Design a protein around this ligand. Structure first.
Ligand SMILES: CCCCCCCCCCCCCCCCCC(=O)OC[C@H](CO[C@@H]1O[C@H](CO[C@H]2O[C@H](CO)[C@H](O)[C@H](O)[C@H]2O)[C@H](O)[C@H](O)[C@H]1O)OC(=O)CCCCCCCCCCCCCCCCC
Ligand code: CLA
Ligand code: CLA
Ligand code: CLA
Ligand code: CLA
Ligand SMILES: CCCCCCCCCCCCCCCC(=O)OC[C@H](CO[C@@H]1O[C@H](CS(=O)(=O)O)[C@@H](O)[C@H](O)[C@H]1O)OC(=O)CCCCCCCCCCCCCCC
Ligand code: KC2
Ligand SMILES: CC1=C(C#C/C(C)=C/C=C/C(C)=C/C=C/C=C(C)/C=C/C=C(\C)C#CC2=C(C)C[C@@H](O)CC2(C)C)C(C)(C)C[C@H](O)C1
Ligand SMILES: CC1=C(C#C/C(C)=C/C=C/C(C)=C/C=C/C=C(C)/C=C/C=C(\C)C#CC2=C(C)C[C@@H](O)CC2(C)C)C(C)(C)C[C@H](O)C1
Ligand SMILES: CC1=C(C#C/C(C)=C/C=C/C(C)=C/C=C/C=C(C)/C=C/C=C(\C)C#CC2=C(C)C[C@@H](O)CC2(C)C)C(C)(C)C[C@H](O)C1
Ligand SMILES: CC1=CCCC(C)(C)[C@H]1/C=C/C(C)=C/C=C/C(C)=C/C=C/C=C(C)/C=C/C=C(C)/C=C/C1=C(C)CCCC1(C)C
Ligand SMILES: CCCCCCCCCCCCO[C@H]1O[C@H](CO)[C@@H](O[C@H]2O[C@H](CO)[C@@H](O)[C@H](O)[C@H]2O)[C@H](O)[C@H]1O
Ligand code: SF4
Lengths: 153, 176, 61, 171, 74, 160, 42, 180, 176
């Protein structure tokens, strides 16, 4: 007989390679273990991925709160970069800026150095409330089992 | 001899040949890109920023008769005619092309193996002396880095306070 | 061609024209159609064998 | 066996050479994770918690002028929220992240074995040249005590609304 | 309704053309009777050999299309 | 709107709904309340009303006959009428054909292909059935690798 | 189960009947829970 | 000769005990007709998805992302209330993940073409926790048992949510026995 | 043996990496079936078309010829507005250009995409020539992607690319 779902094309008369690549043992965090070109793990290894991610976060910190901040009025005021007008580009007085790449305000997301901000913050809702596993105001599963065992027909 | 970051190993590609090399490459850009290209970029940034700092200082006090004066040097740019700005841009492009000999890309910029930052510009012949050449290479790179940071600071603080650098220093107001 | 070889038929009137069969025997006596080809596909008449000449068969690779 | 837990066998990944190593790993997290990563994490937590505990106590004792005006007299995590709106926490986080980029580089040097865990070569006053092992044991012990202490202070604040010293004065 | 009857007409035209074109192109020979041009245009059949060869002529294709042409014009 | 009126606002569609509901209610009037026939007819009325309301909101266009008409020209406003339904078909049909062809080849390279075609090897058949979910890229891969299209000189043909 | 009985169940008509009954059930249940779908909803 | 899990039934022939979690449990004999490598890959994928599913159903009842769209303690209601574009994005991302992680070998005919490919091994070990031979077997057994437990738990959670119409924690705290 | 683009798959047989712009990316194997020189020429022509198209999708939003000032900044609306005569003249110009391509494809052999157009003699240096060939291929690819996106964005928003960016209606409301 045939055992189905072998995963081997030659068993099913399907095209396949003849020499399969060997599997090297190397890992990249935020990457995978598999065949790679020579020097790939050294040049773009876990160190590369992690340090690049750290740089990306440090650059996110300015980007998240991107905007022209001015104290000319006597208080710190934020104005979108889109407000600025640029000479020498004909009709387009107002030109794309970083907000084009990162439209936080359009979606109503209050970004911050850390991902979430005051207006847009993770919401923690307490599930327990005032309930108790037994002999509580809330009628729990254990309460149901106790009542059932003490019930009277 | 001393390393910029003692707890990190000296980067492999930084062997001290270039001026100002204190083994500072913690993120290892030299392991990805050609160090000649990186040093050319560093020197170009530093020179542009040295000129930019001197311009920030002069523009706040002295304005050319043909142009109008903005409140701050960053606003002088918006005040000045757009055609004039375009002319400056195209002149800079022509200068770059001619100085690099129409070898403007990483592929061919150093095809003749010219020293990074060496565009043959020495009208007064200041760098004829070798020892003076080395000392002035160190001075150039250090002053260029300091001017890079200083131009960033001047740009951002001028945009914030809406007052020139010296005007801000004379009338310093805390942001909050 | 030799015995036990795959040969493609080149006879237009043949049920197996441009199809591959296996040479079962080649008669050197000097008859008109010496080679004998077996086929897995049966013809309309129900025969899976035929006699062909050396010019009506080409060895396949 | 384990000096700390006599009835449990010494963890395999704990040789005992590291500062503060008393064979305390009943759950075997060292067998799961690289011990260099764990040592770096422990030293980091130790230093951050020491600064945090000293900061809670020192904020109870004294407050810088201007910061009181901006935070409206808020304390601990409420001061955190007020000064997030202020923008000061943003500066602290920016510069701490700038430090932590090179911290990541140093972490990978540790994992490559070139750097000892937690060794940033920062000793301007030269206090560790006499007995570095002794100082390291002191640092680890004080850091563990500070982690527990900052836990206690923060949860006491969550319970009562009062800082460490104010709580102790108004239990 | 016009759409549906139009596509019925398309079916009719295409099937009549199918029968007629097949008859014309296989008139000279097929794999069943590879020497049909020898027998001509309107021979009855080739016998019950080779599975049966009823209606193996191009005339038969005409005869079979005529049913379909009548259907389509209907 | 193309050449007709929206079905949500057509007196003909409303009249058809009314007629259907009235037929069902006349059939219901002769059955006691709560009996299986009454419940069945009530459910029929509810289904009719739901169908008509959903057709109205779907954005279907309706002619003077009061019946929805389909715009199968390519207009994206009416894609759900022919194109998306037809894409689902083409997906399923390519799946079926690809797995069937794969099984034909699998049986071809067997001891008894005819036995495999009358008495199937259902483990391998289910294998192919599973494979059929990426049939577009698989079929194009076969085409470009040359395993799909046979040469003109390797296919039997009748004499001219 | 007997391998001969399993081969019989693998015979073509049995498999065709079972597969088409399964498909008919699929269509019938789809129409039972989502009836009167003259269009893809968009 | 007899299975360990079901004593009266004979040991499944294809289950040789090499795989983690193997107690000879295959009463219906799927392994006879389906390759155990494919079956184990499927088992691990199901168990991993159900581990994540149980964790999500339990966690997103107490903590949510900001916004009315993401504010739903009931998981079946979250399925509908969460932004549909986001859900389609997740679907596309899962498809790309399947493709790349399986290295274009995503079918029953080619999945295990490479001898190096092992059932359930997609090259996922970002922190390299599985490089220790001593703990590797224990980790494998824990993963299989966790997948099984999470599969059962997720099925129970989904259907008890269908019945009660309340979250899992909310149901257990305010239990109301089924009435019609 | 292994593709550069996809490290876990074998290199396509026809794509050996020698030709410009080759990273071994052919997951569906077009190169095995179709003539590689024809494919390269088609890719180069598509890239040139889309480079000009992407430039002209945005240029009217910045400046318009005085004759076509009234025409919409939306490129599709401007296409509708132009009128048969101007479109006929553009078509004749394009066909005259494509007569040379017809001659080079059907009655000549040459490097793919080589129509003899190098008036400024920028391709004489071999190293710069290699960089420029790869740059043309890659900029063409990016322009193809960008212009397809731009066409679909203009379909949806019924506005120009810069106008869409400025108004931030990045997200669709459904089919048009
Ligand atoms: C499998 C092998 C293991 C099996 C071991 C168990 C052997 C059986 C021994 C019986 C233990 C019963 C467990 C029931 C606990 C419960 O229903 O748990 C519920 C309680 C919730 O707390 C109770 O919450 C109550 C809730 O009150 C409400 O409920 C009360 C009664 O429920 C009254 O009604 C009261 O008026 C009403 O307000 C009280 O308010 C108190 O907060 C407190 O008593 O759990 C607690 O106390 C929270 C404590 C944290 C749990 C720690 C467990 C894990 C410890 C591992 C170590 C790592 C820990 C870090
Ligand atoms: C018999 C001739 C004929 C043909 C072959 C077509 C064909 C088409 N028409 Mg139609 N159309 C016709 C007559 C015809 N039409 C007539 C006579 C009218 C007027 C009554 C219309 C009115 C009409 C409208 C109003 C529209 C169409 C559209 C379309 C296109 C729909 C698919 C598409 O845009 O894919 C595009 C998608 C791809 C190329 C690839 C997609 C890739 C992934 C899978 C997604 C398609 C090319 C639509 C369109 O946009 O056409 C350009 C459209 O909006 N047609
Ligand atoms: C509920 C609705 C319904 C039903 C019951 C059917 C039923 C049928 N359709 Mg289908 N069809 C439908 C909707 C429906 N269709 C719609 C909405 C469309 C528009 C997209 C089509 C388009 C369509 C086509 C294009 C074809 C059919 C065919 C068929 C018949 C055979 C299918 C077959 O053997 O599949 C099993 C699959 C195979 C045998 C594999 C080969 C054939 C498939 C269809 C190829 C699919 C992939 C291929 C690349 C598509 C290229 C199409 C292009 C050349 C136009 C069958 C009677 C076929 C027919 O009539 O042939 C004479 C056929 O070719 N249908
Ligand atoms: C290719 C890049 C890409 C881009 C440009 C976007 C763009 C978008 N995604 Mg995302 N998304 C992506 C990849 C991408 N996604 C991938 C790969 C996935 C699967 C892993 C998702 C899964 C996803 C979901 C599930 C959702 C989005 C949503 C959104 C919108 C967020 C709007 C906003 O201001 O959020 C700003 C918010 C943040 C930056 C917070 C980030 C939170 C995470 C969890 C950290 C926006 C259209 C949301 C949407 O459609 O809302 C209407 C939404 O619900 N996306
Ligand atoms: C894919 C190529 C392409 C196509 C199909 C069009 C099509 C069009 N352009 Mg043109 N345009 C293109 C490239 C293209 N452009 C490029 C590369 C540029 C940058 C110089 C422009 C810059 C441009 C402007 C500034 C204007 C147009 C305008 C127009 C419209 C009227 C014809 C005209 O004046 O052309 C003029 C085209 C050129 C001068 C350059 C094309 C030929 C180069 C040399 C190749 C028409 C829809 C007019 C319009 O209606 O705007 C609203 C208009 O004012 N285009
Ligand atoms: C709504 C959800 C949809 C969005 C989800 C998107 C994910 C789609 C995944 C498709 C997939 O995995 O294809 C898997 C196939 C395997 O095909 C196989 O490839 C085999 C060789 S090999 O796999 O390439 O080594 C080949 O022999 C076999 O015939 C062939 O079928 O991969 C390919 O062959 C080429 C993939 C195409 C790459 C471009 C895609 C860019 C996006
Ligand atoms: C790198 C800097 C630079 C260089 C090397 C350079 C060289 C030359 C040369 C020789 C090669 C000529 C022949 C020339 C001629 C003119 N230049 Mg020019 N120029 C530069 C910079 C600026 C700026 C900033 C402005 C400007 C202008 C004008 C005007 C028109 C004035 C007017 O409009 O009255 C005329 C006639 C002004 C302008 O256009 O103002 C709208 C203006 O602001 N230029 N310029
Ligand atoms: C690196 C380096 C240097 C350095 C340095 C520096 C800056 C060193 C700084 C060291 C610091 C700040 C150490 C702080 C330790 C704090 C502890 C242990 C707190 C414990 C709290 C407890 C137990 C508590 C508590 C409590 C709880 C739980 C709840 C409360 O209700 C009650 C209570 C308060 C009792 C220098 C500059 C010298 C240079 C040198 O070359 C090297
Ligand atoms: C692999 C790997 C990694 C990893 C990882 C990760 C992310 C691992 C994550 C693992 C997770 C999330 C495991 C979750 C298991 C859940 C189970 C067993 C639930 C059982 C529920 C039951 C029995 C139930 C029930 C119930 C029901 C139905 C009825 C209710 O009335 C009661 C109740 C609620 C009790 C990392 C990223 C670290 C990298 C590393 O290099 C490699
Ligand atoms: C041959 C030759 C010559 C020459 C020449 C010439 C004239 C060469 C001209 C070359 C040109 C015009 C190249 C243009 C490339 C444009 C690209 C790549 C655009 C990409 C857009 C993207 C990615 C985008 C986008 C976007 C999308 C889609 C969505 C938006 O919301 C956002 C955004 C805008 C970002 C000369 C004449 C000198 C002679 C010489 O002897 C040699
Ligand atoms: C004739 C006509 C009719 C109606 C409309 C209109 C009036 C405009 C007029 C003209 C229409 C025209 C010219 C339409 C042209 C459409 C175009 C150019 C569409 C372009 C589509 C491009 C697409 C998908 C590109 C997809 C790219 C993908 C996945 C890339 C993914 C990749 C990634 C992310 C990593 C590396 C691998 C790979 C695969 C490269
Ligand atoms: C970053 C550049 C990447 C370029 C490649 C993008 C290619 C394909 C993009 C497709 C368009 C994005 O898809 C989008 O459509 C949905 C329509 O309901 C949007 O749905 C929602 O989007 C916005 C919030 O983000 C809201 O203002 C809209 O009112 C809402 O419709 C989602 O924003 C997203 O799912
Ligand atoms: S039945 Fe067909 S074959 Fe037999 S004789 Fe009559 S026509 Fe010829």
């Amino acid at each position: 007989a045939t055992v189905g779902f072998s995963g081997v094309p030659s068993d099913f008369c399907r095209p396949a390679p003849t020499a399969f690549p060997a599997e090297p043992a190397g890992m990249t965090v935020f990457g995978a273990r598999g065949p790679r070109a020579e020097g790939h793990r050294d040049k773009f290894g876990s160190r590369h991925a992690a340090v690049s991610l750290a740089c990306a976060a440090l650059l996110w910190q300015p980007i998240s709160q991107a905007g022209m901040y001015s104290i000319d009025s006597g208080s710190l005021a934020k104005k979108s970069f889109s407000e600025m007008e640029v000479p020498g580009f004909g009709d387009a007085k107002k030109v794309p800026t970083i907000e084009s790449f990162f439209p936080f305000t359009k979606n109503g997301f209050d970004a911050s150095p850390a991902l979430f901000g005051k207006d847009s913050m993770i919401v923690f809702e307490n599930p327990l409330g005032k309930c108790g596993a037994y002999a509580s105001s809330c009628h729990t599963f254990l309460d149901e089992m106790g009542d059932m065992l003490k019930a009277t027909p | 001899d001393d390393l910029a970051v003692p707890f990190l190993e000296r980067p492999p590609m930084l062997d001290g040949s270039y001026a100002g090399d204190i083994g500072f490459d913690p993120v290892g850009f030299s392991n990805y890109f050609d160090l000649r290209w990186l040093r050319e970029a560093e020197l170009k940034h530093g020179r542009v920023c040295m000129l930019g700092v001197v311009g920030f200082l002069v523009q706040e006090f002295v304005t050319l008769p043909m142009f109008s004066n903005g409140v701050t040097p960053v606003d002088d740019f918006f005040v000045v005619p757009a055609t004039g700005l375009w002319q400056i841009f195209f002149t800079i492009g022509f200068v770059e092309a001619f100085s690099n000999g129409f070898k403007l890309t990483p592929s061919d910029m150093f095809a003749d193996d010219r020293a990074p930052g060496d565009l043959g510009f020495d009208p007064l012949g200041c760098g004829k002396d070798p020892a003076a050449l080395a000392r002035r290479q160190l001075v150039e790179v250090k002053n260029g880095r300091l001017a890079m940071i200083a131009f960033g600071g001047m740009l951002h603080q001028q945009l914030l306070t809406k007052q020139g650098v010296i005007e801000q220093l004379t009338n310093f107001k805390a942001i909050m | 061609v030799k015995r036990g070889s795959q040969v493609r038929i080149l006879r237009k009137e043949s049920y197996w024209y441009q199809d591959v069969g296996t040479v079962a025997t080649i008669d050197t006596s000097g008859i008109r159609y010496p080679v004998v080809v077996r086929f897995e596909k049966v013809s309309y008449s129900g025969v899976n064998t035929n006699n062909f000449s050396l010019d009506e068969v080409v060895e396949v690779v | 066996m384990s000096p700390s837990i006599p009835f449990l066998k010494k963890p395999d990944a704990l040789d005992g050479t590291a500062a503060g190593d008393i064979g305390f790993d009943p759950l075997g997290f060292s067998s799961l994770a690289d011990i260099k990563f764990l040592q770096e994490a422990e030293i980091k937590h130790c230093r951050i918690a020491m600064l945090a505990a000293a900061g809670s106590i020192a904020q109870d004792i004294f407050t810088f002028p201007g910061y009181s005006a901006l935070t409206g007299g808020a304390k601990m995590t409420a001061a955190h929220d007020k000064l997030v709106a202020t923008g000061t926490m943003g500066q602290i986080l920016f510069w701490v992240s700038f430090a932590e980029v090179f911290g990541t580089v140093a972490l990978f040097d540790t994992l490559d074995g070139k750097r000892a865990p937690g060794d940033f070569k920062f000793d301007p006053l030269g206090m560790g040249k006499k007995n570095m092992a002794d100082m390291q044991l002191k640092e680890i012990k004080n850091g563990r005590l500070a982690m527990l202490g900052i836990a206690g202070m923060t949860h006491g604040y969550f319970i009562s609304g009062k800082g460490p010293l104010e709580l102790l004065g108004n239990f | 309704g016009d759409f549906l009857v139009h596509h019925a007409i398309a079916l009719g035209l295409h099937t009549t053309a199918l029968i007629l074109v097949k008859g014309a192109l296989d008139a000279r020979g097929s794999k069943l009777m590879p020497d049909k041009k020898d027998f001509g245009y309107s021979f009855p059949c080739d016998g019950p050999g080779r599975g049966g060869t009823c209606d193996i002529s191009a005339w038969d294709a005409f005869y079979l299309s005529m049913f379909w042409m009548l259907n389509t014009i209907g | 709107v193309a050449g007709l009126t929206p079905c949500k606002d057509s007196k003909d569609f409303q009249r058809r709904l009314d007629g259907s509901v009235k037929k069902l209610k006349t059939r219901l009037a002769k059955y006691e309340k709560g009996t299986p026939p009454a419940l069945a007819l009530e459910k029929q009325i509810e289904r009719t009303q739901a169908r008509f309301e959903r057709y109205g909101k779907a954005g279907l266009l309706c002619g003077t006959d009061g019946l929805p008409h389909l715009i199968t020209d390519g207009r994206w406003s009416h894609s759900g009428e022919f194109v998306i339904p037809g894409l689902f078909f083409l997906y399923i049909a390519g799946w079926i054909g690809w797995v069937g062809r794969s099984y034909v080849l699998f049986a071809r390279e067997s001891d008894k292909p005819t036995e495999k075609e009358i008495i199937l090897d259902v483990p391998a058949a289910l294998s192919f059935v599973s494979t059929g979910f990426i049939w577009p890229v698989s079929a194009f891969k076969e085409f470009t690798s040359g395993n799909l299209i046979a040469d003109e000189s390797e296919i039997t043909v009748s004499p001219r | 189960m007997d391998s001969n009985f399993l081969k019989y169940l693998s015979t073509a008509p049995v498999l065709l009947t079972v597969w088409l009954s399964f498909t008919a059930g699929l269509v019938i249940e789809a129409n039972r829970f989502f009836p009167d779908m003259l269009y893809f909803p968009m | 000769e007899k299975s360990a899990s079901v004593p009266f039934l004979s040991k499944p022939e294809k289950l040789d005990g090499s795989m983690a979690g193997d107690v000879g449990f295959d009463p219906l004999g799927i392994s006879y007709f389906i390759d155990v490598k494919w079956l184990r890959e499927a088992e691990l994928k199901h168990g991993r998805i159900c581990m994540l599913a149980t964790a999500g159903i339990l966690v997103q009842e107490v903590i949510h992302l900001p916004g009315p769209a993401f504010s739903s303690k009931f998981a079946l209601d979250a399925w509908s209330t969460a932004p549909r574009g986001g859900m389609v994005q997740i679907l596309i991302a899962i498809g790309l993940i399947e493709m790349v992680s399986n290295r274009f070998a995503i079918t029953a005919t080619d999945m295990f073409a490479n001898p190096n490919r092992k059932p359930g091994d997609l090259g996922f070990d970002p922190l390299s926790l599985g490089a220790n031979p001593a703990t590797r077997a224990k980790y494998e057994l824990s993963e299989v048992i966790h997948g099984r437990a999470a599969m059962m738990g997720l099925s129970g959670m989904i259907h008890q949510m269908i019945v009660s119409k309340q979250p899992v924690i909310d149901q257990l705290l305010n239990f109301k026995p089924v009435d019609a | 043996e292994m593709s550069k683009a996809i490290p876990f798959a074998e290199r396509p047989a026809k794509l050996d990496g020698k030709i410009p712009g080759d990273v071994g990316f052919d997951p569906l194997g077009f190169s095995d079936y179709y003539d590689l020189k024809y494919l390269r020429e088609a890719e180069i022509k598509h890239g040139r078309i889309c480079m000009l198209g992407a430039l002209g999708w945005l240029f009217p939003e910045f400046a318009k010829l005085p004759q076509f000032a009234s025409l919409s900044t939306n490129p599709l609306k401007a296409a509708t507005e132009l009128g048969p005569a101007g479109w006929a003249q553009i078509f004749i110009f394009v066909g005259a250009l494509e007569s040379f391509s017809y001659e080079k494809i059907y009655y000549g052999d040459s490097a793919p995409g080589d129509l003899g157009f190098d008036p400024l003699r920028l391709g004489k240096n071999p190293v710069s020539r290699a960089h420029y060939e790869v740059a043309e291929i890659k900029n063409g690819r990016l322009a193809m992607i960008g212009l397809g996106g731009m066409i679909h964005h203009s379909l949806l928003t019924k506005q120009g690319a810069i106008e869409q960016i400025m108004s931030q209606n990045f997200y669709p409301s459904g089919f048009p």
